[PDB]
Amino acid sequence: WSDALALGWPTGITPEAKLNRELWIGSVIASFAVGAIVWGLIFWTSAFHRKKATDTELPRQFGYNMPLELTLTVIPFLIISVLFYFTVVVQERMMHKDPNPEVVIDVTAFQWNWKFGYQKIAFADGSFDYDGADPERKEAMTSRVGPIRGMTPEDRTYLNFDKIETLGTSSEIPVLVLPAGKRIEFVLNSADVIHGFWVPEFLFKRDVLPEPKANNSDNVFQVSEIQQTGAFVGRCTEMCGTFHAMMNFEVRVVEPNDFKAYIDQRNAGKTNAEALAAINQPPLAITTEPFESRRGELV
Template identity: 55%
Template sequence: MCVLRRSMTARPSGLRRVVGGVQEGVKLAHGGRRTPRLGRGGKRLAALGVLGVGALLLSGCSGSEVVRFGWPNGITPESKDMLHLWQWCVIAALAVGVLVWGLTFWTVAFHRKKAGDDSIPRQTAYNVPLELTYTAIPFVMVAVLFYFTVIVQNNVEAKKADPAVTIDVTAFQWNWKFGYRDVKFADGSDYNGFERTGSPFEFQKEEPKTDEEKHPLPDGGRSDEVRNYLNFNKIETIGSSQEIPVLVLPVGRRIEFQIASADVIHSFWVPEFLFKRDVMPFPKQQHTDDRFQVSSIDKEGAFVGRCAEMCGTYHSQMNFEVRAVSEAKFDAYIKYRSANPQAGNAEALKAICEQPLSVSTFPFQTQRSTSGSGTPSKTGDTSNTTLPNCTAAQGA
């Protein structure tokens, strides 16, 4: 019986002890041992990693897009300052988030109630050092972010006297008017294009409207001195239902925008500026800052602009284009339009060998996509707006 018992309890030669789901001692055909399998938790982590990488690949995100955390690529020094502030804000938020999420998941995973365990966990009252720590750290983080916010905001809103280019921006339902008030040319000469002030009522003729669409306009029985707050210039570009207004600007020069609305509140927004400013009627009476500057535009090309304030029926179609060109082309553009006052904006653009019409958007377009399969087929190459095989016109 003893011999029989030993033979029954002995481990068969064909079996191996199983440890952690992996059979010890089982030899594979190639002579090695079986690789330990991932546990259930490891498989989940691997699946999450694959899903994360797949989402990035399918979304077409490049490395530079990922570090911008959803913001466009800025084209002014001010936009880069704002991007850096945004990046550090997101990093700080992610750091706090990872800590909070980690502690939450750790508590759920290792301190959840177990089946059959009805005991009450050990109770703790308070921990003064810990509470002071997690009160002080957020306070320091907020104080640091506040400090850099003030620094960046002051830099973005800084205005220097005597900018190289001054643009009068007038918003009206549902389009834009751009006027060139002052320009300093590269050769040292100046151009002054201011003509007169005018009333919002002058814009009723720009876009004929039905009685239902007409806005009473912000007259309110005011005197002409108060009502005539809009600026009119000798060289202007006015948008219409047939043509997107193209605002031609030079790279490398400080530009000031003086903004006003002829009717309701609008908002001047160029995504690549990473900045927008509300456009108010009666800005002086509203006590609003109707001027802002960019120290320079760093990149040539076409950049779509939009109204970012709900302003009525056709708000989504109230687009314009910023066309950034070289300093030489800009000077030639202003001189051509000054010498040919009857020439339209498209003719002047063609005279300096630029695409005559908008290439970043078109009338009645409401799409917001600027790249990929969602890009409207009617738009052109926004990074190269030069006309091929073109010779600049005489006087341009």
């Protein structure tokens, strides 16, 4: 069974996730085969090489087997070389970026929640085009000699702003709406510290950094398509402060026609909750719910 050999790995909703899961199962099979051999050898000598009651002389005092030793350094080298090749193949596919994505999402991480913006939508069939860039609010952050290349540490111009934005709340989980079967581009920028953009169904995550360009970090990753609709939870993975465990989000995948209807509702001034209700979807997140603001059960 693949589920037993997956050890809890989600099946995946993207082709990159499927390829990553296939690599995981094969590597686990290879690791288990090696472990069984070594565990068997350890158990064999522990059960059959114990000191008997009818032995008086010490055993043979051998401590060097050159042909065996040279053989036991080549076999592990071959296994890692095979694994390295498939490792390189998979990461190249997972990190590949198409110059023409169909949906571009601006992911803004902060302490302690999320903000999702729709930068640009360009369907490959030409049935929906939308430019959500907001450059009149990106130029309002400039702060300027400056300690760093003429800029103060409060420059914040690296962040992206959009007309349609889903802002996370302490009593409202932010829900990101994406179309199924379309290429999605995620641009990650962090306001303050480092956060983690992890969708377990994506079988992939990347750290969200402040000033990613200045840190030589590639903050853009793409998925070829999402193969099924539904709701999938997302969690922060990088230690970001007091509420690192209480800033989860949800990704809602709907049909292309549904996504077009939802964007029109958002353009019509509707909030995220009521726009989702306009396309016959739950207004709030269903995989996760907001955490109680109370600091504990003893409060």
